[model samples]
Target: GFRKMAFPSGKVEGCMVQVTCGTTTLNGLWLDDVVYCPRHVICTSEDMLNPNYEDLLIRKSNHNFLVQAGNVQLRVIGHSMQNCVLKLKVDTANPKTPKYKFVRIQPGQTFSVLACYNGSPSGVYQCAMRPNFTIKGSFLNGSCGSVGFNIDYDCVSFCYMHHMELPTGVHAGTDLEGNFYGPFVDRQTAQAAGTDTTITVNVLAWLYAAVINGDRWFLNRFTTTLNDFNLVAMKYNYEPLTQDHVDILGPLSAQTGIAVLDMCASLKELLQNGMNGRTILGSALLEDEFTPFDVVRQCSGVTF
Candidate 1:
């Protein structure tokens, strides 16, 4: 199988000394494929559901109610004609030692009880409430006048990044199930020998890198390829290049560390003088009706 090794040197990034093996040589620079990492699944189980728990604690009219422990705030809504005292009792389980608070509210007025004690208590405790006066619309008496709702003492809650019952046999690396390559394999290695299961790096990215670093072999190959493509069908009265073809050259030149304005100017001069528009270098400017001045306007702008 084809193999390449990267050693520590004052060359590529991270002091990398890269070399390719097997019978083939890299005419073009190597590029690496993007790696896809693992993603966490969302939690959606019966234990994690929190549906309408807050709805049960809300008081209807002047009716008294008991809310759960974890909820810190309780809202007491009034729908009466006159002001009345709402008696709030905290920790209802120990009736002998009950804590109480009185709140005065007028018609259509709402009062919030900010006192909460069951935030971290062992087992669940209920907080009960009752009014000093009878509700104007209610005909019921005794326990019916006071509403009793339960706070689930043992309700477990936490953020879960994965499901409760996940598949046990998932491979950690790329495979036939559409996982990306982890430890990357360069394209030169595959070209030297045969193909492997690992994904090859991108060739254009390496060519761009080689151009930026002034690698002789790769730069020669790039210009040769450009000339070969440009000269094809030159005498057939064909346009040789289209707007779509020119669009790529702009960013390609930018990535190769070439000045887009000078490149555009030189390319326009050649194209106007029967250069056939075959070169990918400046075809995009011609297609988009952009002039050398337009290209020069973006001189201070970021390339690529």
Candidate 2:
């Protein structure tokens, strides 16, 4: 049953309820219910409901929740209280499936509320008879929101090419010196604040290019035999390296254009076999210089 105030604050039976700092979980609030004057029909702030309960049971049940009275009440509750204070709190949990999950506002209400008050939405409500509660979540209010990603030009030749399919947003832009930074509040402001995003970008791009180029130059020299080639040509012409050959040891018979063409064909077969299953093909073609992920995908023939 709805109970009445012991010594009514105002004569009016019902009035609008509003409080300060109410954009979050009602943890601790200083409530001042509006009421009409008994002497006059006008509302007055008289003997208000000066009790604060913190026993989060969703309802009053065989409980003697205590509170103190004062215009400036210095009240604090650890384990028991009513819908008192609203504050911003993080919901650390993730749902099994993806979707927004509202956290309970308080006992008497069924809605999610934010700590910072700037008027979000609020009709998301549900009242439970068993708990004597009205739960509701207002529109989330704050400067914060989710963000999307954008791959920049400097990073373009590297990562998976399919990453290009992603939508774009504020990019961590770089400067002429190859410096990188941002996705920040404002690039100018961040720079003024002594946060250099440029120099860092330049250093990273330079280092990556150096390492890859050096490695490519080193591996292109290996062959089966003579001419000090890690790979050499076969001792006999009995088997002119066929395109269908499973294994072709040694280097090309001659250094002619035709010989080179044969070697290219033989190399292709070796790569397909080695890359597919046999051995890990650490070898990289000078042509597939940048974007290793894309190159692998091309070799494997995967879309993503």
Candidate 3:
């Protein structure tokens, strides 16, 4: 004979039960009752028969996720008084293994995770469940989208080309300013601001050209060698040349001799102008002919 047991007092009147059948263990909490004797159904999965005890509330909300730049992210918010487990499963191609994570969330708490996928065909899904009950919510399909890359440009040539074919609603802008303002948002009053985009594009293109042409062809090595030649010319100007100076430059005398003559001639003309400064400057001598402008040309060999 079974003794009459006292019924538990709560909104849900089921008992928490654990059953072991062979090697497998089954777990569940009973919140309902079937027969008049509610104690008999305690902790049993069949407690669903009791309608009054079926008021267990589990809330899930604010679910959001996205795939961008070859990575996936998930965010889950919990609003119920009960704790919940959030599970994510990501399926990719055969070579790439699937990714997954389990997040424990308390009431009024949030859980999130981010993962990367390397050019794999993948789809994602998530679910939330309570600890005791075996009843799980359906899997919410995650729209983990994919992106493609373009490599049409031949990098070996003067051109390096790669273009991303953006779908509609996606826009791109220069690094100086992000895509939040004009071009993305425009009005008749923004006509003057529109010119900023044009100016940035043209200026960047011209600056890039100057770097490639000036640095490579004219300035880098030529600057060093020309500076060396000018140093020789200036040294000969201020002091008497020793045999060692000619010995050092004797090897390339054929080519360097021309630069030396040019610089020397310029210095001579500069001296003559100063000596005849009264006529040249319509004024004076050593200090007269060598005006600021004359000394400028005598030194760097560069003119504005």
Better lDDT candidate (2, 3) = 3
Estimate the lDDT of model 3.
0.20
What ranking emerges by lDDT with the best candidate at the front? 1, 3, 2
The residue-by-residue lDDT of candidate 3 on 206-243, one tens digit each, is 22222222321111222223344445435433222234
In candidate 3, position 198 carries an lDDT of 14
Q: Residue 43 lDDT in model 1? A: 11
**Candidate 1 lDDT by residue in tens digits, 1-304:** 1111111111111101111112211110011211111111011133124322123224223233222223322232322111111122322232121122112221111111111111121111111111111111111111111111111122111100000111221111111122222321111111121111110011232233334444323122122233333343243221233333345445656655653333333433433454343423322222221222222223223221
Q: What order do you get sorting by TM-score, best first?
A: 1, 2, 3
lDDT: worst 10-residue window of model 1: 157-166
Q: Judge candidate 1 at residue 274 and give its lDDT.
A: 44
For model 2, residues 98-138, the per-residue Cα lDDT tens digits are 11111222111111111111111212121110111111112
Best by lDDT: 1
By TM-score, the better pick of 1 and 2 is: 1
Better of 1 and 3 by TM-score: 1
Give the Cα error of residue 57 in candidate 3, in Å. Answer: 23
Better of 1 and 3 by lDDT: 1
